[PDB]
Amino acid sequence: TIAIVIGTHGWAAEQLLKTAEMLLGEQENVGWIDFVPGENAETLIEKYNAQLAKLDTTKGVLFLVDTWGGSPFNAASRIVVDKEHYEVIAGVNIPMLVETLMARDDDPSFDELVALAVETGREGVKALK
Amino acid sequence: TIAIVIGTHGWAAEQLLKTAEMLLGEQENVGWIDFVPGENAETLIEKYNAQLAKLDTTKGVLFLVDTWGGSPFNAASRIVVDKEHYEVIAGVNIPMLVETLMARDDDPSFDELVALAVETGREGVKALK
Amino acid sequence: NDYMVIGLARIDDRLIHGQVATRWTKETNVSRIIVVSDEVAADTVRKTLLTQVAPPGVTAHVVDVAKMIRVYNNPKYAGERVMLLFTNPTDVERLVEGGVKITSVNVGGMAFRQGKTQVNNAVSVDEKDIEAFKKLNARGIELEVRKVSTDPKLKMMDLISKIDK
């Protein structure tokens, strides 16, 4: 399947994955990194690369990060730059993770998965009222 | 300020708060709960109530939860039902948490904060491309 | 000269504050903004906030003085109009010494502080800031002090001349 790597400031990426697996069962071909004060984008690029070495990236890689413009985002941006089937999507939330992981198994195309992740992430934000 | 309570399946709520505090500094008047397999909505209602007892809820309470329809959402829904200035917003992400915590200090009205949280949560989901 | 084009050099210890950056961006027709400061570059939290509030259609970058000289040494931005943001005139003289070409420097604002002398409503200079301005003027570089483009332009030397001789 398409590889997914989650990165967030601090130690939330591992827990967002754990939450998803509590809903969907353990997932394959998913990696994550943490970002600790003192580290820079270059440290993070190495961390992302070490995770990718263990993933099947033949169909592509989707980096799901916490916020636009943070170090996790900046480092992921430097990796995907001239790579086909590599994308970075900011604002990762549980609706995005769950929908994306579910669709991934039905072997969608890369563009289809990227579009679904953005759409479900946004539609997942809703007030009860 | 307006109270914020974060709830997700698993143990991600505490980490989403930690991530936010890594960006903004330690926050006051914020609570969180976890949801473990075996627990039901009634357990969660008690957990939310115990957290609220420690918060200043005079200006209102905003429950930020992982997904629409899960137990964390269902339990929070039962608490806010006929309460003024109580709302539940699903799809919590870092952009939503950061913007919401920042605005809260400028003492916005409850409706203003709820609207900002939904808007920033959705606008925070964006692909690099 | 056949490389990047400095659309404008604004000095401000606050970098982006209010709409000074919004209005100056549209009036200066700038689509890129580069921040040169080692202290800010070392603040990953501040960089994230500045990058997330970067005006729409405008990109904000954060680099150090050494890295900035290299970005300018790349013709990839030739013709591109970029705005340079500095926190102190000392960092401006450093870029000039690296062979950076500057025709004029604009003083946007400087947080006042004890031991410094107030030259404008919100512009303060220390014996070090003044010394840097004098060197730029000795090189034929123009020095103008102004908070907004709509306010009257004053000469840095004139303000310092009525204070420091």
Q: Where are the beta strands (DSSP E) in A1-129?
A: 3-7, 30-33, 61-65, 86-90, 126-127
- What token pair was written down for B102? 């920042």
Instruction: Kindly list the distances between the CA atom of residue B27 and the CA atoms of A38, B4, B22, B23, in Å, as whole numbers in the listed order.
Output: 21, 10, 10, 11
Interface contact flag, A71 C52, Cβ < 8 Å? no
Q: Which of A67, A68, A71 comes nearest C44 by C-beta?
A: A71
Decide: B64 and B80 in contact? Cβ < 8 Å.
no
Length of chain C: 165
Q: Among residues C5, C17, C38, C153, which one is catalytic?
A: C17
Report the interhelical angle of A94-104 vs A110-123 (nearest 10°).
150
- List the beta bridge partners of residue B101: none
Largest CA distance in chain C: 45
Contacts of A1 (CB under 8 A, 6+ apart): A28, A29, A56, A59, A104, A105, A107
Centre a 10 Å sphere on the Cβ of residue B107 and count the other Cβ atoms it contains.
11
DSSP code of residue A73: H
Instruction: Kindly list the distances between the CA atom of residue C154 and the CA atoms of C6, C143, C150, C158, C165, in Å, as whole numbers in the listed order.
Output: 21, 9, 12, 7, 17
Closest Cα to residue B72, out of A98, A94, A122? A94
B9 in active site: yes
Contacts of C39 (CB under 8 A, 6+ apart): C87
Q: Which CATH architecture has domain B1-129?
A: 3-Layer(aba) Sandwich (3.40)
Nearest CA in chain C to B120: C52
Percentages of chain C per state (helix, strand, coil), in multiples of 5: 35, 25, 40
Method: NMR
Asked if C56 has any chain A CB less than 8 Å from its own CB, the reply is: no
Q: Among residues B6, B9, B20, B85, which one is catalytic?
A: B9
From CA A9, how far away is CA A27, in angstroms rounded?
Answer: 22
Nearest CA in chain C to B20: C45
Interface contact flag, A124 B68, Cβ < 8 Å? yes
CB contact burial C105-121 (16+ within 10 A = b; e otherwise): bbbbbbeeeeebbebbe
Instruction: Kindly list the distances between the CA atom of residue B95 and the CA atoms of A39, B30, B116, B120, in Å, as whole numbers in the listed order.
Output: 21, 16, 11, 6
- List the beta bridge partners of residue B86: B61
Nearest CA in chain A to C46: A70
Decide: B9 and B72 in contact? Cβ < 8 Å.
yes
Domains of chain C: 1-165 (3.40.35.10)
Parallel/antiparallel/unpaired status of strands C5-12 and C104-109: parallel
- What token pair was written down for C141? 């570089």
Q: Give CA B45 to chain center in angstroms.
A: 14
- List the beta bridge partners of residue B89: A127, B64
Instruction: Kindly list the distances between the CA atom of residue A19 and the CA atoms of A9, B12, B15, B37, B90, in Å, as whole numbers in the listed order.
Output: 17, 7, 12, 11, 15
Please, where are the H alpha helices in B27-109?
41-52, 71-80, 94-104
Contacts of C44 in chain A (CB under 8 A): 37, 40, 70-71
Decide: B94 and A66 in contact? Cβ < 8 Å.
yes
Contacts of B124 in chain C (CB under 8 A): none
From CA B2, how far away is CA B29, in angstroms rounded?
Answer: 8
